[PDB]
Each structure stands twice: as C-alpha cells, then as structure tokens.
Design an enzyme around this catalytic site. Structure first.
Site, mmCIF file in Angstrom:
data_model
loop_
_atom_site.group_PDB
_atom_site.id
_atom_site.type_symbol
_atom_site.label_atom_id
_atom_site.label_comp_id
_atom_site.label_asym_id
_atom_site.label_seq_id
_atom_site.Cartn_x
_atom_site.Cartn_y
_atom_site.Cartn_z
ATOM 1 N N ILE A 199 38.281 37.963 51.098
ATOM 2 C CA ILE A 199 37.566 37.123 50.152
ATOM 3 C C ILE A 199 38.354 35.819 50.057
ATOM 4 O O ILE A 199 39.615 35.851 49.991
ATOM 5 C CB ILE A 199 37.454 37.771 48.747
ATOM 6 C CG1 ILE A 199 36.893 39.171 48.827
ATOM 7 C CG2 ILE A 199 36.602 36.896 47.839
ATOM 8 C CD1 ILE A 199 35.550 39.238 49.517
ATOM 9 N N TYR A 206 51.715 46.984 50.111
ATOM 10 C CA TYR A 206 50.368 46.622 49.739
ATOM 11 C C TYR A 206 49.405 47.755 50.075
ATOM 12 O O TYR A 206 48.662 48.213 49.239
ATOM 13 C CB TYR A 206 49.957 45.363 50.449
ATOM 14 C CG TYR A 206 48.654 44.879 49.986
ATOM 15 C CD1 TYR A 206 48.490 44.463 48.678
ATOM 16 C CD2 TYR A 206 47.589 44.740 50.849
ATOM 17 C CE1 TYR A 206 47.286 43.956 48.236
ATOM 18 C CE2 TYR A 206 46.381 44.238 50.414
ATOM 19 C CZ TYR A 206 46.238 43.851 49.098
ATOM 20 O OH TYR A 206 45.026 43.380 48.607
ATOM 21 N N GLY A 220 44.451 39.068 36.072
ATOM 22 C CA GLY A 220 44.432 38.182 37.197
ATOM 23 C C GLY A 220 43.537 37.000 36.905
ATOM 24 O O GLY A 220 43.043 36.348 37.831
ATOM 25 N N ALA A 221 43.414 36.690 35.613
ATOM 26 C CA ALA A 221 42.431 35.715 35.085
ATOM 27 C C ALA A 221 42.685 34.278 35.545
ATOM 28 O O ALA A 221 41.772 33.465 35.489
ATOM 29 C CB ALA A 221 42.423 35.743 33.523
ATOM 30 N N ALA A 241 50.187 50.866 50.633
ATOM 31 C CA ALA A 241 50.566 52.005 49.796
ATOM 32 C C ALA A 241 49.954 51.947 48.405
ATOM 33 O O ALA A 241 49.463 52.955 47.910
ATOM 34 C CB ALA A 241 52.092 52.083 49.677
ATOM 35 N N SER A 242 50.071 50.770 47.771
ATOM 36 C CA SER A 242 49.643 50.507 46.421
ATOM 37 C C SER A 242 48.100 50.591 46.327
ATOM 38 O O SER A 242 47.596 51.072 45.320
ATOM 39 C CB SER A 242 50.118 49.092 45.959
ATOM 40 O OG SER A 242 49.366 48.032 46.570
ATOM 41 N N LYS A 243 47.384 50.053 47.332
ATOM 42 C CA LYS A 243 45.925 50.089 47.360
ATOM 43 C C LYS A 243 45.352 51.500 47.662
ATOM 44 O O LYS A 243 44.320 51.933 47.083
ATOM 45 C CB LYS A 243 45.379 49.061 48.365
ATOM 46 C CG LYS A 243 45.676 47.618 47.969
ATOM 47 C CD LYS A 243 45.255 47.354 46.511
ATOM 48 C CE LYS A 243 45.184 45.850 46.199
ATOM 49 N NZ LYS A 243 44.700 45.624 44.816
ATOM 50 N N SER A 256 41.263 47.351 47.736
ATOM 51 C CA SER A 256 41.223 46.449 48.959
ATOM 52 C C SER A 256 40.813 47.352 50.116
ATOM 53 O O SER A 256 41.012 48.590 50.006
ATOM 54 C CB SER A 256 42.614 45.940 49.323
ATOM 55 O OG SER A 256 42.675 45.158 50.548
HETATM 56 N N1 LIG Z 1 41.325 37.713 48.215
HETATM 57 C C1 LIG Z 1 41.227 38.777 49.056
HETATM 58 O O1 LIG Z 1 40.909 38.631 50.244
HETATM 59 C C2 LIG Z 1 41.393 40.190 48.583
HETATM 60 C C3 LIG Z 1 40.890 41.237 49.390
HETATM 61 C C4 LIG Z 1 41.006 42.556 49.017
HETATM 62 C C5 LIG Z 1 41.592 42.814 47.801
HETATM 63 N N2 LIG Z 1 42.071 41.820 47.021
HETATM 64 C C6 LIG Z 1 42.613 42.204 45.694
HETATM 65 O O2 LIG Z 1 41.808 41.510 44.745
HETATM 66 C C7 LIG Z 1 42.619 41.281 43.586
HETATM 67 C C8 LIG Z 1 42.584 39.777 43.229
HETATM 68 O O3 LIG Z 1 42.821 38.968 44.365
HETATM 69 P P1 LIG Z 1 42.660 37.374 44.330
HETATM 70 O O4 LIG Z 1 42.273 36.931 45.699
HETATM 71 O O5 LIG Z 1 41.835 36.993 43.190
HETATM 72 O O6 LIG Z 1 44.180 37.033 44.126
HETATM 73 P P2 LIG Z 1 44.834 35.692 43.519
HETATM 74 O O7 LIG Z 1 46.269 35.716 43.940
HETATM 75 O O8 LIG Z 1 43.992 34.459 43.654
HETATM 76 O O9 LIG Z 1 44.925 36.086 41.991
HETATM 77 C C9 LIG Z 1 45.541 37.247 41.478
HETATM 78 C C10 LIG Z 1 45.943 36.887 40.044
HETATM 79 O O10 LIG Z 1 46.750 37.991 39.714
HETATM 80 C C11 LIG Z 1 47.765 37.545 38.942
HETATM 81 N N3 LIG Z 1 48.958 38.320 38.873
HETATM 82 C C12 LIG Z 1 49.771 38.622 39.912
HETATM 83 N N4 LIG Z 1 50.858 39.224 39.457
HETATM 84 C C13 LIG Z 1 50.802 39.303 38.144
HETATM 85 C C14 LIG Z 1 51.681 39.789 37.073
HETATM 86 N N5 LIG Z 1 52.853 40.404 37.349
HETATM 87 N N6 LIG Z 1 51.232 39.676 35.791
HETATM 88 C C15 LIG Z 1 50.060 39.089 35.545
HETATM 89 N N7 LIG Z 1 49.254 38.589 36.474
HETATM 90 C C16 LIG Z 1 49.556 38.669 37.757
HETATM 91 C C17 LIG Z 1 48.135 36.257 39.691
HETATM 92 O O11 LIG Z 1 49.029 35.345 39.056
HETATM 93 C C18 LIG Z 1 46.782 35.618 39.931
HETATM 94 O O12 LIG Z 1 46.479 34.658 38.922
HETATM 95 C C19 LIG Z 1 44.016 41.845 43.867
HETATM 96 O O13 LIG Z 1 44.176 43.100 43.181
HETATM 97 C C20 LIG Z 1 44.036 41.815 45.376
HETATM 98 O O14 LIG Z 1 45.014 42.622 46.025
HETATM 99 C C21 LIG Z 1 41.956 40.517 47.360
#
Ligand SMILES: NC(=O)c1ccc[n+]([C@@H]2O[C@H](COP(=O)([O-])OP(=O)(O)OC[C@H]3O[C@@H](n4cnc5c(N)ncnc54)[C@H](O)[C@@H]3O)[C@@H](O)[C@H]2O)c1
Ligand SMILES: NC(=O)c1ccc[n+]([C@@H]2O[C@H](COP(=O)([O-])OP(=O)(O)OC[C@H]3O[C@@H](n4cnc5c(N)ncnc54)[C@H](O)[C@@H]3O)[C@@H](O)[C@H]2O)c1
Ligand SMILES: NC(=O)c1ccc[n+]([C@@H]2O[C@H](COP(=O)([O-])OP(=O)(O)OC[C@H]3O[C@@H](n4cnc5c(N)ncnc54)[C@H](O)[C@@H]3O)[C@@H](O)[C@H]2O)c1
Ligand SMILES: NC(=O)c1ccc[n+]([C@@H]2O[C@H](COP(=O)([O-])OP(=O)(O)OC[C@H]3O[C@@H](n4cnc5c(N)ncnc54)[C@H](O)[C@@H]3O)[C@@H](O)[C@H]2O)c1
Lengths: 233, 214, 211, 214
Positions: free
Chosen positions: A178, A145, A6-7, A147-149, A132
C-alpha cells in the site's frame, strides 16, 4: 467512538480523516503528531494522545486518561506498526524486540484493555488488527516483521474465540503493498501482484468500514487479504 | 554438535538421551537442571538476552560452536486473557519467540563466518495453526515462530542453512486413538536434520494425530 | 449484468432478490426453478453450459459479474460414497465454476472489459469434516481455482475471489449466519471499493475456523 | 505389500526400485509400462473408474489387498486457461483427484473389513498451496488432494488408517541453490509409512527447498 493507532501517517491517518467525516468521535494514538496538529486546533471530535506504544506503562496511562475522561471506545483499530529492513544477522535483540513490542504486544494490550471495559459494560465491541501479507508469506531482511505479523494473525484468532460469547468481534486485515509513508522496485511490486494497480490507503479504510459495520455481524477471527493478488501464488 | 534448549524436560530432555546415544556432542540449555559423556549442561534463563550473550562469550572462549540448533524451550500460559498481565504475555514471547530468534541469529552468524552448513529445528505447536481459549500469548508466540521459521529459511538458504519447524499436537479432537509421545517429535527432528532432509527448508511438520485436520 | 448460479435456493436466491432491488440485470442459472432471465440448467452437463453461452452470444448478454453459488454437499460415510456421486459433486462444485469462469473471462478479454467473479466455497474448503470427502475436496479445489484464475487474468482487470461461509459451540459467536451475511460480502467484493482485492478468500463463519 | 500409482515414471518409478530393494511386494499401477522379484504390473488408465473397480475385483480373487497406498500417478497441464477445454480439465481432475479418491476408498474398505492398520500417502504439489500461471486444473486438483487427505484422515482415524500428503516443489524462487531429486520424495514417503510415523495423519509435508516460504 473509534480508537485508531498509527494516526499520524498512512493507513491510520486515512482512517482519522474518513471517520471524522462520517461523524465518529476519534481517539488518535501515535508517537508523532506533526500531521495531526492542524486538526487538534479545530473543534472536531478528535482526542489525540502522544504515546510510545512500545512502552506498556504508557499504555496504562492512556487507559487511566480515558477512564477519567469517560471515553470507552466502541471500536479499536490497531494500525500502528514498524518494519525493519536489515539483514537478520545485523538485527539486534532490542530491535527485534521493539518490532515485537509495537506490532504485537501493543495490539494485545490495547485489545485486553478495551475488552475488559466491554465485558464490564455488556457492550458489543469491535477490534480490527492490521497485519500484512508478511503474516502469510516471508520476505528477506524482515525476521521480526514477518514474525510479528504471523503473531498478530494468530492473536486475532485467539481473541476472537476468547470474546465471541460477549459479541466482541476481532478481525485482521493483511494489506499487500500500500502506498504510504512506510513504502524498478515498482516493476518488482507489479510483477509480484496479479493486478496492475497500486494498493492505496482507501482500500484498507474501506475494508475497515466493512468490518466495523452491521453487515459484519457474523465476521470474527477472519483475515481479509487486501493485496492485489500477492498471496495468490 | 547439537544445541538443545528445553533440555530439562519433555521433548528437549528426550532429545538429550537420544543424540548422546547417537554419539552427538550435546549442549543442553535450560533454566532447571535437576533432570540433567560429551554433554555440556548450561543453567540459563533464556528470556534474559544478556545471559544468551554471555553463553556465546563462553562458547567462543571454548572454541565450541553448534552444527545444529533445536529450539524446544517453551512455556504455555493457561490464563483467561483478561487475567493475562503485560509481563506474563511478554515472558511467554521472550521464551517462545525471542530466544529462538537470538539463538538462531547467533548460530547462523558463526555458520556464515565459517562457511559451514547448519540446521535449525523450531518446536512450534498446533497452537501455531489453530487458536484455543486461554492461550493469547501461547498462540501468538507459536504463530510467530512458524513465521520466524519461514523467514530465516529464506534469509540463510543460499548459505545452506536449513530452518524448519515441527508443530506437535498433544504429547475426541484427534483423529487417531493414541497419545502423542516425545519420541514422535524426536524422530521427526532426526529426520529434519539428516541428509535425507537436504531439500527441506521453511517447512512446518505437523505431528498431531489428526488434530489440525478439521 | 450479473450471472448467479444456485438461483433457486439459499445464497443464490438471496442474491436474486437483492440485486434486482439494486437495479441489476440478473441471469439466474439453476437445475430447479420452482422458486431477470431464468435458465433451467443442470451445471454438471458441460454441453448445456456451452449452449447457454451460445444462446447468450445471440442475445448480446455477457455478464459483467459471475457468482458461482451452485453447490451440493453429500453427507455420506466415505465407504458408501460411490464413484458417480463423487464426480457429480466435483462436476457441480468445481468443474462448472471453472467452465463458467473460463467462458465469461473469454468475453471480457475479447471485449477488453473488466470482470468480477466471486466463488462461493465453504469453511469445508479450509477444514475437513467426516463423511464429506467430495464436498471437502471440491471446496478445497475451488479455493485453489480462485487463486489460480486471479493470477491468470489480473492484468486484464478481471478480479477473482472467494467466500467461505460457515453454517448459514463450534463457533465463537452465539448467532446463526444468514444468507444476508454472504450477500453483504458479495456486494463488497463486486464494489468499486474492491478494486485492489483478487485471489483472496473471505471467511464469514462466526469464528468456526478460528481454532 | 505397497500399491503405487504412476509406477512407470518419476516419483512413482523411483519408489519401485526403492521398496523392491527393501523386500516389499509392490503393485505398480500406470497407463504405460515401458520402464517396468515380487512385482505385479497393471497397465491401467486411472481415469477409467470401471477398470479400477475391475482391478480390485481381480485383486480380491488373488487375496492381494495392499497394506500401503502411494498415490503418485499425476498430470500437469501447462496451458493458457482460455485454451484449457472442458475435457482437459476433467481429465486432470480424474487422474489427480478422482483416482486417488477411488483407490483410497477401495483399499480402506478392505482395511476396515479385515481390521488392518493401513497407510495412504498422497503425492500433491506446491501448486496445492500456491497458484501458478497456466495451471488451473493442476492447481485445483492439487488443492483438492490436500483437502481429501485431511478428510479421509478424519474418516478412518478411529480405524488406525493414516492418510498423509507430500507436496514436492521442483523435482531463485527457492531459498536453497539446488534441485529436488526423486529420492527427496522417496525418503519422505519411507518416513510416513514407518512405525515412527504412528502419530502422523492429516498432515501435509512440503519438500520444496523454500519455494512456499514467501
Ligand atoms: N504500507 C504498506 O505497504 C503496508 C502493507 C502491509 C501492512 N502494513 C501495516 O499497516 C500498518 C500501517 O502502515 P502504514 O503504511 O500506514 O505505516 P506508516 O509508517 O505510514 O504509519 C504507521 C504509524 O504508526 C505509528 N507508530 C509506529 N510506532 C509507533 C509507536 N511506538 N507508538 C505509536 N505509534 C507508532 C507511526 O509513527 C506512524 O505514524 C502497520 O501495522 C504496517 O505494518 C503496511
Ligand atoms: N507437550 C505438548 O503438548 C506440546 C505440544 C506442542 C508444542 N509443544 C512445545 O514443545 C516444546 C517443549 O515442550 P515440552 O512439553 O517438552 O515442555 P516441558 O514443560 O516438558 O519442557 C519445556 C522446557 O523448556 C524450559 N524452559 C522454559 N522457560 C525457560 C527459560 N526461560 N530458559 C530456559 N529454559 C526454559 C523448561 O524449564 C522446560 O524444561 C515447547 O516449545 C512447547 O511449547 C509442546
Ligand atoms: N448454507 C451453508 O451453510 C453453506 C456453507 C458453506 C458453503 N455453502 C455453499 O454455498 C453455495 C450455495 O449454498 P446454499 O446454502 O444456498 O445451498 P442450497 O442447496 O440452498 O442452494 C444450492 C443451489 O444450487 C443449485 N444446484 C445444485 N446442483 C445443481 C446443478 N447440478 N445444476 C444447477 N444448479 C444446481 C440448487 O438447485 C440450489 O438452487 C453452495 O456452493 C454451497 O456449497 C453453503
Ligand atoms: N516432478 C515435480 O516437480 C513434481 C512437483 C510437484 C508434484 N509432483 C507430483 O508427483 C506425482 C508424480 O510426479 P512425477 O514428476 O513423477 O510425474 P510424471 O509425469 O513423471 O509421472 C506420472 C506418472 O503418472 C502416470 N499416469 C498419468 N495418467 C495416468 C492414468 N490416467 N492412469 C495411470 N497412470 C497415469 C504417467 O504415465 C506417469 O508415468 C504427481 O502426482 C505429480 O503431480 C511432481
């Protein structure tokens, strides 16, 4: 060496920058790289792989490249994720499955693979899964979502037990809301928190730093909730 | 009319005899039928979503829709995680999570269109609360199911569609000196579907002889 | 300024050492003192607590941070567990955190100042064990209390969190936990990096609660 | 024979009608009796542990040991936490947690002595699973009670004494458009004391119309 999914965005990208600043060697996984291109131009110890984490074949081709390049990551951070917001009756089979393939299946596969290498080498590995608050409390319009979490928390616990004897610690972090690319509505967020502050990527980054540290020697299988009191009640 | 997956064995099978004997119309789903009155038995691989879609095409041609869904089809790998392939991980997930989701979406759709009440009971496990060794997929899938349950209970509550789960123990580590039996799970289902369960939704009923206690 | 209950032993003592070494004004509370303001106090006595707060109101000392580590674990078959032994464990493990927590929060709200409380609970707050009815009740209660007080005081920037230590075969890891694993967590939880963390329970247990 | 705290009001009360009407001998325990056939009413303050010890001396002399115990006596403060005094917190604890502890140890002693197969149900709350504003003692007590359920289930399981709890929601933050009624709690109690509950102990049954779902 720290491998971060998710870089390209949000949490994963805040990790890329933070860990490069502290002199780690970084392997960045993402399906997009528009926000990593600049850094690819530099001489920083940064290996970017373009990869669709929902394709398990492509995940093997990743491990083929890493093995051939002699990169065994010491730490895996599974942050890549997707989140639908659609009525459950409009959520298609494929898209339920996609959310599962990215949010659960990919962490499992990447975890099995790094753990294979750590077992083989007697290295003391570390894995952090980003779940999450939707892994603890449900939300409307998020069947896959939630389910997966929930599945990922479970997986963290299972895999902590599987590999603890090998001193591979596996933990999860459950962020609340976040502010990132993923995320009136604001007053609703606050009314559902205890704290009057916004969740930021740095709050997750710091937790990761704690959990990869030597101070976390006795931490495995735990879920650290970083949510401003969302889950409190 | 009750739809029951995993009808060919154990919990699902015991549910067949019991609701037939209670006068329900029964739609039995399983990949096997060797172990199988108003009873439609369907030979179906529930990891194949094309085959679930075709089941519903057949049901709509028959003007047959369930009032009740019991998701008891399930598989448990016992494999060390290093030896758990990609495909086997996914298969366990497709049986234990994706199939309940599809079957539930589908019966919810038709309950919502008919403006009829509905009830779903998901068979989870204590492996949904507590991990065990050699169970990467089983545990992740059962956790996922519990989460799926709470989500869909929230999704459909307003339409009076109740969605709950049951987490059986084994059917030393227990508190009671007895074996869990199928009938222990059937009785809880019977309860969860009844009018007495009118206010119960999103709940996980643990039937485990004290296994999860500590 | 930090106030630590259970200062004479284990997790509480390890904190006294660490937070002096880090420049904190420490206030140790404990029934014993055989091992920096040191107060000899039985925390199962509610009027002693009210007096400690009287004394402290006269000295200008109201902690910025509270660490409820004073605790006792009965190991008693439940049929031999008397009414009074049960209340005492409850008075130390639950009632005192609540009285101590209400009192610091009072002063923080009045002063309009941020505070931070860390409640030392236990994996017995999550999973039961035989012969520990008070202990398990009490540590379950304290987890509950942490979440409630996190809600009560959130909008005054008072953060309330807990830690559930395992034992400081039934674990996943082959090492023994150490008071330092718990001290490192307390340090993280009182940091500025924990600005967003409240109502959370941090499990530090070698995998004990994993399954 | 079924011993029921809080018999004068709400859920304990509704259990009085219910189990009398099904031929149980009932022992009603409450501090008030204005809302109270084989029935023995005891006026008792369950926060006074001398009186509890008294009741049981008496009951022993009458050779009345209850077969079943329903712990339903309860208090909820609704008070801002800065105005919740020591006494008030202790009283909530004494009623909601200490009394069920004592009553439970007391009836288990006699079940173990006589080799009876006993049954205890604890009335907890959704505030046992989730905090709320202005309920520090209530939330802590109700979390305490879930924890005690699991522990005493573990303690007395070799003796076939089942200990379980029920967590009522309200008897918008629900998924169902509906109120709980005491009967939803009573049917669940009936189910937990039955022979079909033979494999059930340590468990917590949420009956809340989706409150805890998310
Ligand atoms: N932002 C929030 O409020 C929040 C809260 C709770 C949990 N989360 C979890 O935190 C994590 C990151 O969230 P974020 O806010 O940084 O999300 P974001 O969407 O800004 O970034 C996630 C990154 O994951 C990458 N990604 C998605 N599908 C992909 C694939 N098939 N192959 C490769 N890369 C892929 C995306 O392209 C993106 O660059 C996730 O696992 C998310 O569910 C986020
Ligand atoms: N028996 C236990 O100890 C136990 C404990 C907890 C949970 N569970 C769960 O209870 C449910 C039933 O278990 P059981 O003990 O009755 O199992 P079982 O093996 O006796 O019966 C499960 C049935 O599910 C069916 N099934 C599997 N894959 C299928 C597919 N692709 N398509 C259609 N049907 C398929 C099987 O053919 C079998 O008939 C499962 O969800 C299981 O995980 C069982
Ligand atoms: N060590 C473990 O394995 C473990 C595991 C889970 C939780 N805990 C919890 O962590 C906390 C401290 O643990 P520990 O291992 O340091 O135990 P300990 O016995 O080493 O330290 C407890 C301290 O609390 C103090 N204390 C006890 N009763 C008191 C009273 N009535 N008034 C004032 N002070 C009193 C004692 O005097 C002692 O100094 C406790 O809350 C305990 O329940 C410990
Ligand atoms: N009604 C709800 O929405 C709800 C929700 C969650 C939990 N509960 C729980 O269900 C149980 C019963 O609740 P209710 O709604 O029927 O409450 P209620 O206040 O209607 O009745 C409780 C009874 O307990 C008795 N009692 C209180 N203190 C006593 C003492 N010291 N000695 C003897 N008796 C005493 C009271 O006199 C009262 O008759 C309680 O344990 C409560 O916390 C109720």
């Amino acid at each position: 060496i720290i491998m971060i999914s998710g870089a390209n965005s949000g949490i994963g990208h805040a990790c890329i920058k933070y860990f490069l600043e502290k002199s780690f060697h970084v392997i960045a996984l993402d399906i997009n790289n528009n926000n990593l291109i600049d850094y690819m131009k530099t001489d920083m110890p940064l290996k970017v792989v373009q990869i669709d984490l929902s394709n398990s074949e492509a995940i093997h081709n990743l491990f083929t490249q890493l093995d051939l390049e002699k990169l065994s990551p010491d730490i895996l951070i599974n942050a890549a994720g997707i989140r639908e917001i659609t009525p459950v009756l409009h959520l298609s089979d494929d898209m339920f499955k996609k959310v599962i393939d990215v949010n659960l299946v990919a962490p499992f596969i990447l975890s099995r693979e790094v753990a294979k290498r750590w077992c083989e080498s007697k290295i003391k590995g570390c894995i952090v899964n980003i779940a999450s608050v939707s892994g603890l409390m449900a939300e409307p319009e998020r069947a896959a979502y939630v389910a997966s979490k929930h599945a990922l928390i479970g997986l963290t616990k299972q895999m902590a037990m599987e590999f603890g004897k090998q001193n591979i610690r596996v933990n999860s972090i459950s962020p609340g809301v976040i502010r990132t690319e993923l995320t009136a509505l604001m007053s609703m967020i606050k009314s559902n928190q205890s704290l009057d502050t916004w969740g930021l990527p740095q709050d997750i980054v710091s937790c990761i730093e704690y959990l990869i540290s030597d101070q976390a020697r006795f931490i495995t299988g735990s879920n650290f909730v970083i949510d401003g009191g969302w889950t409190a009640g």
